[PDB]
Write a protein that binds this ligand. Structure first.
Ligand SMILES: *[C@@H]1O[C@H](CO)[C@@H](O[C@@H]2O[C@H](CO)[C@@H](O)[C@H](O[C@H]3O[C@H](CO)[C@@H](O)[C@H](O)[C@@H]3O)[C@H]2NC(C)=O)[C@H](O)[C@H]1NC(C)=O
Ligand SMILES: Nc1ncnc2c1ncn2[C@@H]1O[C@H](COP(=O)(O)OP(=O)(O)O)[C@@H](O)[C@H]1O
Ligand SMILES: CC(=O)N[C@@H]1[C@@H](O)[C@H](O)[C@@H](CO)O[C@H]1O
Ligand SMILES: *[C@@H]1O[C@H](CO)[C@@H](O)[C@H](O)[C@H]1NC(C)=O
Ligand code: ALF
Ligand SMILES: [Mg+2]
Ligand SMILES: [Mg+2]
Lengths: 1028, 324
């Protein structure tokens, strides 16, 4: 609860207007990037190996483990350091822009970084807001300004914000006249839409006229000011506390199931590495037992090496085997899986199949880490109105006093006034040239398309709303009689209560509380005699698929109204939980209201909102519809969408069959444990409510011989169709929570377009926000955002499928290629005195991962479609059902590990059997152990490259390039390193090994045959699948 | 509106192989039919290579060389009798094998000094510290430091034919040209400058086990030291315990007479090198070389097995489908 004083003149504790969106600095980039890299299972492992190499004496040089790491580390550091110099640049541009301040009758021009809480900022037109202001005045009267948060939450409509009344008299002249104020405001919350405050404007002598603030005054930070002259504000939050700057924390969902399989594979390869090293030491000391297997007179130890403690030697030899077999763990997996996710996050927003010609926008990717969690979804939780059915409401068939008006002159007039009042339509002030339309432009611009429809449906009859004339409301009442009204209170609508209300004052008399709400939330408090008459029409209208709103009114007396006056202004003047203290007040202001009538509004399904739920039911998913609308309206929309097929037996847990605390459990268990487990896709579908789901979950803490929630989840999992009617915005998330837990990890998705659906879009694994008629509130809490439901089909089926396949076959292959590398070097230890002698040269050991095999798999993981991206969407029937994580399980993992073992065995023991020759040339010259290692390495490089070339089914010029160029670079580097690489070396060990190995037809034929024998167990699966 | 280029839209021009039966079986058949012919030409070229290996280590009480199996008067002299049933035709290559001899031992491969064998005057007079226990002795630096250069095979094998008389016709062996051309003409040079090669090796010694300096390994200055081909050939490590290194090459005589006529031959050994200790063998191998190397059946049998398993699978598949 902060207390600002307007001019900073009495009647420091606060931050300074400088935003820092970056992470690092110029002085803690390394100390902070390195620590956060080397904290990963493999970066730490290779740092350990490098240090063990630098301190101890080991088989393999220290460069072979610290050049491949100083690179994988300096590439990620460059990436992240630049991707943050961008943030530094941007913050500098934002908070180094001039902003005039009215210091003391002086219009100073400071910089946005030097603004402090409580000083009158002066914003001109088209100038974004330097900090969270509170519009204390404007130039024009009427105290209003048009703000367009084109950047905060994506929206692009000119919302209108209101000044503080007592202050609009202040304009550009002595506004610094010690305008005594005390703006008590709640502590900064990132809510971006809520705000709780209070003003204490003082007079010359004594005054405390405080106008309780809200989100109607707070001009957020970084929200452009549109089409006005100039505004004065009193900064309240000053950067790093203002919501625009407090919403920088939005990461902690991006954790896929293909980032934990990488760690299971890493753990397995560590326990493979330790078994290699332990077996080789156990056998290095069961071999050295014989006195002539150590120092046999041709190689004799050195005095020191001879007089070293024994156990110390066992330890140092275990270390030298871990430092020899240390490449069995991929050094370049992290940088490749990060550069892949970076460079491939775009394809799902560059796509021109997510492009709505109306909204003039496409898709939006707010988290590039779940990219491969779309191709894994198992449940899909939708919202009915807004996603399945766009908010194009067409008013049809009002119903006055249960008469179906289409009551002579007694109450119809009241019903039509009700429809015209009790909303917040706010026609666009200016109107275009009149004469081409029916009445005029009169573009009703509201936020709730249920009100727009009712005003247009009243206009169809006599009444015509045109008002909001600065405190008044005007309507033509079937005769051109403007008939001013006066809005005294707007008991706004909230999803939980389901009733909007208004307290108008007739032009020449009493007060009237109009209340439009849902039938469930308006019949409870009415004159019960009319419920039984209007509910039949409500029920017909519902069963035909229409949205039904009940309209009621109440005549308020003076003293009762003077009591509600206090009861309502003391709810807003209170800083502590005013939303709740106000719900609890205008929830008893609406007690016994004479029901006037009901109104039905027809709504249509989106473009392909049925051919997408069919495409989602085909690919295996289980589509639940968590709506807030009625039960027969939702059920009709579900029958339209083809969620419920024609011959489906519906299980209704609604309030039409469950009006008893104990009579619910009857069905709850009878239609599960004796019904749906003893007795389909088209036959069974469940229909629940909100009150009934509460009964089940909340107070199921008493009867637990057969748990309520448990039996119910059991009922649910045997149904691919479930419709949760009358669900509130928090039960919508209770359901995703319930499901995220059962019988494993059913990967849930949740797709919504409103403010109700901002809870499950945050709860579920991957959230999708639609950008529709309501606003961009969910599109910004969501991980992805698509302007249509029908885009979910393409997203899941043809983007998650490819995003998941590419990374699963990057992960499998990154371990394959390294087990293939290192199995020959482990087998060589037997045909060696177990002396840990590297099979391969040193250049080869460093390069294999970062030069010879690095690109091909990256190009594959980016540009590759194992099923053409057109057949992928044309066929969901399986292509998606085919990989329920299946591509990274035990089965495939061990297939790959056994293929790599087979190939390493073939490489080694084919070169072994080829080297029994006495010569492989025709001049009869013999080959050393460097020509044994380069033969095994040639076979290895080519077999891994061609195992990937046999996997690519989509051969872009870039695949051709990377694959054949990786092979040609191996072959050119090897000749270049064979030739003069002399002066700086201590070895000259590979001086012509390649160019002599390749002068033997016999080694050529052996390499060809071993590449083929190694790829055979793969060319065999190809054929066994092409057949049958 | 969204950038509608070929690449951003994931619709680059691609190939996309269609793998269908009539596109997948002729593969098995083609590799079968291309391998079995190769794996028969190779098998035949191998089996047509005549070789003979005589294990002259001793250790068999009845063997001629058991009189120097033990540590005896430095210059032993044994001789073994072998018989060439089928004459050797081309130019022949004499090797020497060694078993249980790990030239591929980490401590043993490290043990050279390439900077010195490459003629670097700086490393001549102070060898490295990888060639460790054999890096200095008698307060001097050893010329070919290291284990590799110290434990150099050093017993002299000679061949004789037994004509229609019993007199031995001495077969003529050739030493030049048995080491990779590069690593005798590039990677191995003598110390920098001088006229006589014993001046250049001035502040150095001879390795421990040797008998003469490096500058007295051969009389023709083109084979003297650091350039001696037998040295260079010993120094290229074996890669497996049981190895063999080219010893001599007998060149076909321009006459129409085979190199090694059939008949009876003496192999007389100046047995110097002891392998009895670490339980090794010493063998002399006379062999003939083809376009493919030497007698080794692996390539032939392996090509034939691969090309007769691919063909068996191709037949099973043609049966399955075109019959079903
Ligand atoms: C051929 O090679 C053999 C074995 O490589 C040589 O044998 C070694 O020769 C040196 C002297 O030239 C021997 O003294 C050495 O013996 C070892 O122990 C003795 C004492 O017992 C010690 O004086 C030496 O320093 C050395 O450590 C021999 N090593 C063996 C027999 O294994 C042989 O001389 C060479 N013959 C030639 C060049 O004709
Ligand atoms: N402007 C409104 N005034 C009064 N009641 C409303 C209004 N808009 C919606 N309602 C009621 O609130 C319910 C829930 O609306 P909401 O939470 O937006 O979900 P949905 O639009 O999917 O029904 C509606 O079914 C209706 O009964
Ligand atoms: C000289 C000759 O040709 N014959 C030799 C003979 O001297 C001995 C014999 C030993 O078994 O081997 C044969
Ligand atoms: C060849 O071996 C025979 C066996 O007696 C021997 O007479 C002859 O002298 C040996 N060669 C030499 C060293 O002349
Ligand atoms: F249309 Al809804 F919650 F039912 F946004
Ligand atoms: Mg709504
Ligand atoms: Mg949605």
């Amino acid at each position: 609860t902060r207390t600002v004083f307007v001019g900073n003149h009495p009647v420091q504790r606060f931050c300074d207007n400088r935003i820092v969106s970056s992470k690092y600095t110029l002085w803690n980039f390394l100390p902070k990037n390195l620590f956060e890299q080397f904290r990963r299972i493999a970066n730490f492992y290779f740092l350990i190996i490098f240090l063990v190499q630098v301190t101890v004496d080991t088989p393999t040089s220290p460069v072979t483990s610290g050049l491949p790491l100083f690179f994988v580390i300096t590439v990620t550091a460059i990436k992240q350091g630049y991707e943050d110099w961008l943030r530094h640049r941007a913050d500098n541009e934002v908070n180094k822009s001039t902003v005039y301040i009215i210091e003391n009758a002086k219009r100073v021009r400071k910089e946005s970084e030097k603004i402090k809480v409580g000083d009158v900022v002066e914003v001109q037109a088209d100038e974004t807001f330097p900090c969270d202001l509170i519009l204390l005045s404007s130039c024009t009267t009427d105290g209003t300004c048009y703000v367009t948060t084109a950047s905060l939450d994506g929206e692009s409509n000119c919302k209108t914000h209101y000044a503080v009344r007592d202050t609009i008299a202040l304009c550009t002249a002595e506004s610094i006249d010690t305008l005594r104020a005390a703006i008590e405001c709640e502590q900064p919350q990132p809510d971006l839409y809520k705000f709780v405050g209070r003003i204490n404007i003082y007079s010359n002598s004594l005054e405390a006229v405080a106008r309780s603030l809200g989100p109607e005054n707070l001009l957020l930070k970084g929200a452009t000011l549109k089409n006005t002259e100039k505004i004065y504000g009193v900064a309240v939050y000053t950067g790093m506390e203002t919501k625009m700057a407090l919403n920088y924390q939005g990461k902690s969902q991006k954790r896929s199931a293909v980032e934990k399989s990488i760690n299971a594979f890493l753990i397995v390869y560590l326990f493979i590495l330790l078994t290699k090293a332990a077996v080789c030491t156990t056998l290095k000391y069961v071999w050295q037992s014989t006195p002539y297997n150590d120092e046999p007179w041709y190689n004799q130890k050195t005095q020191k090496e001879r007089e070293t403690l024994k156990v110390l030697k066992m330890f140092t030899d275990f270390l030298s085997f871990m430092v020899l077999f240390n490449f069995i763990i991929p050094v370049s997996m992290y940088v490749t899986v990060e550069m892949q996710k970076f460079l491939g996050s775009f394809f799902i927003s560059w796509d021109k199949d997510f492009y709505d010609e109306e909204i003039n926008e496409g898709a939006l990717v707010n988290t590039s880490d779940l990219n491969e969690e779309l191709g894994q979804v198992d449940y899909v939780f939708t919202d009915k109105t807004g996603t399945l059915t766009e908010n194009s409401m067409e008013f049809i068939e009002c119903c006055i006093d249960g008469h179906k008006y289409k009551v002579d002159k007694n109450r119809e007039e009241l019903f039509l006034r009700a429809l015209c009042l009790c909303h917040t339509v706010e026609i666009k002030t200016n109107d275009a040239v009149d004469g081409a339309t029916e009445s005029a432009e009169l573009t009703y611009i509201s936020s709730s398309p249920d009100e727009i429809a009712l005003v247009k449906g009243a206009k169809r009859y006599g009444f015509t709303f045109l008002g909001n004339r600065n405190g008044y409301m005007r309507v033509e009442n079937q005769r051109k009689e403007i008939e001013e009204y006066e809005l005294l209170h707007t008991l706004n609508f909230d999803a939980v209560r389901r009733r909007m209300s208004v307290i108008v004052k007739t032009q020449e008399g009493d007060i009237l509380l109009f209340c439009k709400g849902a039938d469930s939330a308006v019949f409870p408090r009415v004159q019960n005699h009319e419920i039984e008459l209007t509910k039949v029409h409500v029920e017909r209208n519902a069963m035909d698929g229409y949205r039904t709103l009940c309209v009621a009114f109440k005549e308020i007396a003076p003293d009762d109204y003077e009591r509600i006056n206090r009861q309502l202004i003391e709810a807003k003047m209170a800083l502590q939980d005013r939303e709740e203290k106000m719900e609890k007040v205008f929830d008893d202001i609406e007690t016994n209201m004479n029901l006037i009538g009901a109104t039905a509004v027809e709504d249509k399904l989106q473009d392909q909102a049925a051919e997408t739920i069919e495409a989602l039911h085909a690919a295996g998913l289980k589509v639940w519809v968590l709506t807030g609308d009625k039960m027969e309206t939702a059920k009709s929309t579900c029958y339209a969408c083809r969620l419920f097929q024609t011959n489906t037996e519906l299980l209704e847990l609604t309030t039409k069959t469950i009006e008893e605390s104990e009579r619910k459990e009857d069905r709850l268990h009878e239609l599960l444990i004796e019904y749906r487990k003893k007795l389909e896709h088209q036959e069974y579908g469940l229909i629940i409510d909100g009150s009934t789901l509460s009964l089940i979950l909340n107070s199921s803490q008493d009867s637990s011989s057969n748990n309520y929630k448990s039996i119910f989840l059991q009922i649910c999992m045997k149904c691919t169709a479930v419709l949760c009617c009358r669900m509130a915005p928090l039960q919508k998330a209770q359901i995703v929570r319930m499901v995220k837990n059962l019988k494993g990890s059913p990967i849930t998705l949740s797709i919504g377009d409103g403010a109700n659906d901002v809870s499950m879009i945050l709860e579920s694994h991957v959230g999708i926000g639609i950008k529709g008629k309501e606003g961009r509130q969910a599109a910004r809490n969501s991980d992805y955002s698509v302007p249509k439901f029908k885009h979910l089909k393409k997203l899941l089926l043809a983007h998650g499928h490819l995003y998941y396949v590419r990374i699963a076959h990057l992960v499998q292959y990154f371990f394959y290629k390294n087990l293939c590398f290192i199995l020959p070097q482990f087998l060589y230890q037997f045909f060696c005195g177990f002396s840990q002698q590297p099979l391969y040269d040193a250049a080869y050991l460093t390069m294999y991962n970062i030069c010879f095999t690095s690109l091909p798999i990256l190009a594959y993981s980016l540009l590759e479609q194992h099923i053409n991206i057109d057949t992928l969407t044309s066929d969901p029937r399986l292509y998606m059902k085919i990989s329920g994580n299946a591509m990274l399980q035990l089965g495939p993992f061990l297939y790959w590990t056994f293929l790599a073992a087979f190939e390493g065995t073939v490489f080694f023991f084919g070169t072994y059997f080829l080297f029994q020759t006495a010569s492989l040339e025709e001049n009869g010259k013999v080959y050393g152990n460097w020509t044994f290692g380069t033969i095994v390495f040639t076979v290895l490089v080519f077999t891994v490259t061609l195992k990937l070339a046999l996997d690519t089914r989509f051969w872009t010029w870039i695949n051709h390039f990377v694959i054949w160029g990786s092979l040609a670079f191996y072959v050119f580097f090897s000749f270049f390193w064979g030739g003069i690489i002399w002066p700086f070396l201590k070895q000259q060990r590979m001086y012509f090994v390649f160019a002599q190995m390749l002068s033997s037809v016999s080694t050529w034929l052996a390499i060809i045959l071993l590449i083929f024998i190694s790829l055979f167990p793969e060319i065999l699966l190809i054929v066994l699948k092409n057949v049958r | 509106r969204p950038d509608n280029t070929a690449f951003k839209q994931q619709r680059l021009p691609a190939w996309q192989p269609i793998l269908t039966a009539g596109t997948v079986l002729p593969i098995f058949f083609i590799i079968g039919l291309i391998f079995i012919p190769i794996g028969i030409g190779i098998f035949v070229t191998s089996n047509n290579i005549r070789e003979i290996e005589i294990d002259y280590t001793g250790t068999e009480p009845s063997s001629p060389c058991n009189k120097c199996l033990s540590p005896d008067v430095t210059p032993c002299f044994c001789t073994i009798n072998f018989t060439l049933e089928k004459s050797f035709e081309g130019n022949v290559f004499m090797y020497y094998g060694l078993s249980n001899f790990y030239q591929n031992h980490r401590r043993y491969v490290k043990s050279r000094d390439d900077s010195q064998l490459n003629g670097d005057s700086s490393a001549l007079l102070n060898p490295s510290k990888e060639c460790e226990p054999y890096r200095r002795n008698e307060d001097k630096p050893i010329a070919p430091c290291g284990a590799i250069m110290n434990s150099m095979f050093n017993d002299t094998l000679e061949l004789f034919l037994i004509g229609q008389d019993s007199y031995p016709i001495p077969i003529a062996l050739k030493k030049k040209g048995i080491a990779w051309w590069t690593d005798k003409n590039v990677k191995f040079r003598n110390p920098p400058g001088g006229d006589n090669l014993e001046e250049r090796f001035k502040g150095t010694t001879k390795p421990v086990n040797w008998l003469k300096p490096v500058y007295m390994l051969d009389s023709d200055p083109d084979n003297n030291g650091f350039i001696n081909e037998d040295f260079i050939v010993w120094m290229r490590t074996a890669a497996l315990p049981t190895f063999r290194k080219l010893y001599r090459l007998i060149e076909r005589k321009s006459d129409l007479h085979p190199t090694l006529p059939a008949g009876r031959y003496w192999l007389n050994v100046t047995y110097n090198y002891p392998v009895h200790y670490f339980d090794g063998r010493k063998r002399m191998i006379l062999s003939t070389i083809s376009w493919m190397g030497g007698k080794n059946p692996f390539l032939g049998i392996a090509y034939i097995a691969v090309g007769s398993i691919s063909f068996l699978l191709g037949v099973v598949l043609l049966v399955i489908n075109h019959k079903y």
